[PDB]
Amino acid sequence: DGPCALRELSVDLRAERSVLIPETYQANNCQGVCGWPQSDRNPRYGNHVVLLLKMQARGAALARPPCCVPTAYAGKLLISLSEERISAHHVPNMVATECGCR
Amino acid sequence: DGPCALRELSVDLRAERSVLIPETYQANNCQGVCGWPQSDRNPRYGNHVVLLLKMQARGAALARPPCCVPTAYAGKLLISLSEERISAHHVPNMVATECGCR
Amino acid sequence: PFLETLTRLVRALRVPPARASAPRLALDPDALAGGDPLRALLLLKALQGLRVEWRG
């Protein structure tokens, strides 16, 4: 398991009539546990997160503890092939490329 | 409870020698549940989140379901008063001001 | 001479509450790290803040 870090998650796109390029659609996702003090490889925490962690350590019990989530994304392009028409589409904010707990 | 939104959370800053201004330190927190289809008041979801929600709906079981987290911050200024010295500090990324689940 | 009187006044004005339940936690400020022109503008800022604080 280890600390908050990125990992693979992919699917396959299928159509009954046309053919899609690329086939394997890749969209990563991260998982793990980020604790106090930090033992990670991503940038340093913010002030909000350290405040929440200290509140937790003192003895309180929060209703929404910190979580590992993404903070950056990248776009993608798809091509659909069929007789009498070849089409292309571009969609932004599809692939995760960096993440850290907030 | 309701859906993902912003809520109040504040503390008191105390010092044994100097006096701090302002006293009550305010730092809101994001809390709630975001589902499918969206019934919220924040901006529309991204493509990653809808992909994850559809994966969950089909029958899969993810190891890290989407969570309500903040996405913006603001700085703050503090003043410390004591004999022979009045000091001021500015710290960024302290107060949460928006929510949206990722 | 002058600032100490301001500190005493600020301490005096902060009267304790009379509510029967704790409003929130208290935490010391220790680990969220960052003709004098200082003592000139800082006091202006402090008085501006006290203006809003005292109305409560």
């Epitope: - | 109040e8 | 304790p16 029967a20």
Partner: antibody, heavy 120, light 107 residues
Framework: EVQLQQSGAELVKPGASVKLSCTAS????????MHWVKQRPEQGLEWIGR????????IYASKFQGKATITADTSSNTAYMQLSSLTSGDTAVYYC?????????????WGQGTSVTVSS | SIVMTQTPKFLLVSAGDRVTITCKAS??????VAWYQQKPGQSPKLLIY???NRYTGVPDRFTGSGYGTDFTFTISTVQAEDLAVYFC????????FGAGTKLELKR
């Protein structure tokens, strides 16, 4: 962690006074108030009073006024309650408590209970 | 002072039923309420604070709701480890601790 420790059971004559104690551990009492609670076998729970160690301002209920004195000492993280003018109706169990409830977080800690008996 | 009335005063379940308890107030108490639990020979322990949140370690069976002047606390599927007495507390003024409700099983 946090732990609240109390004294042992006591038996007193009908007309004397008692002094119960409650000491914290792994915590600083200056952070928040301390409450004292009473319980009778069948009358249910009740509220006696609270103290604020930082300033020394204490609050008592409208029924226990004049026969219960709460004091605190932060040099060793301890609180005392003096109960006076016993009348054989105070035989009960007393608790030391810390309460905080807020829209986003909460904290609730209780003692172990001290039993007080009045008989001749 | 605010007076809190709790019902029912007694109960009896069959280890598979659903349970509901009501705790009405004598005056507008906003949404400051707490639901506790006390087993024999032990000190109470918080279960629900404010009006809907859950303390750490509480399973998903327990839940509560209400606002203004009516508050309710319900358990979905009773088990054999839920024999205790339940109280409702308010905090808008000098604290008051309800009256208490018992519980029993069948066989």
């Amino acid at each position: 962690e946090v732990q609240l420790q109390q004294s042992g059971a006591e038996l007193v004559k009908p007309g004397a006074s008692v002094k119960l104690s409650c000491t914290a551990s792994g915590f600083n009492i200056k952070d928040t108030y301390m409450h004292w609670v009473k319980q009778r076998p069948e009358q249910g729970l009740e509220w006696i009073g609270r103290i604020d160690p930082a300033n020394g301002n204490t609050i008592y209920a409208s029924k226990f006024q004049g026969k219960a004195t709460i004091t605190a000492d932060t040099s060793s993280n301890t609180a005392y309650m003096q109960l006076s003018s016993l009348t054989s109706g105070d035989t009960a169990v007393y608790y030391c408590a810390l309460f905080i409830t807020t829209a986003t977080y909460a904290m609730d800690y209780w003692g172990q209970g001290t039993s007080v008996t009045v008989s001749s | 002072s605010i007076v809190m009335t709790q019902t029912p005063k007694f109960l009896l379940v069959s280890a598979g039923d659903r349970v509901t308890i009501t705790c009405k107030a004598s005056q507008s108490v906003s949404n400051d309420v707490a639901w506790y639990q006390q087993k024999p020979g032990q000190s109470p322990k918080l279960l629900i604070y404010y009006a809907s949140n859950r303390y750490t370690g509480v399973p998903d069976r327990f839940t509560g709701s209400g606002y203004g002047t009516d508050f309710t606390f319900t358990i979905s599927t009773v088990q054999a480890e839920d024999l205790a007495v339940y109280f409702c507390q308010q905090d808008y003024s000098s604290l008051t601790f309800g009256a208490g409700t018992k519980l029993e099983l069948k066989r």
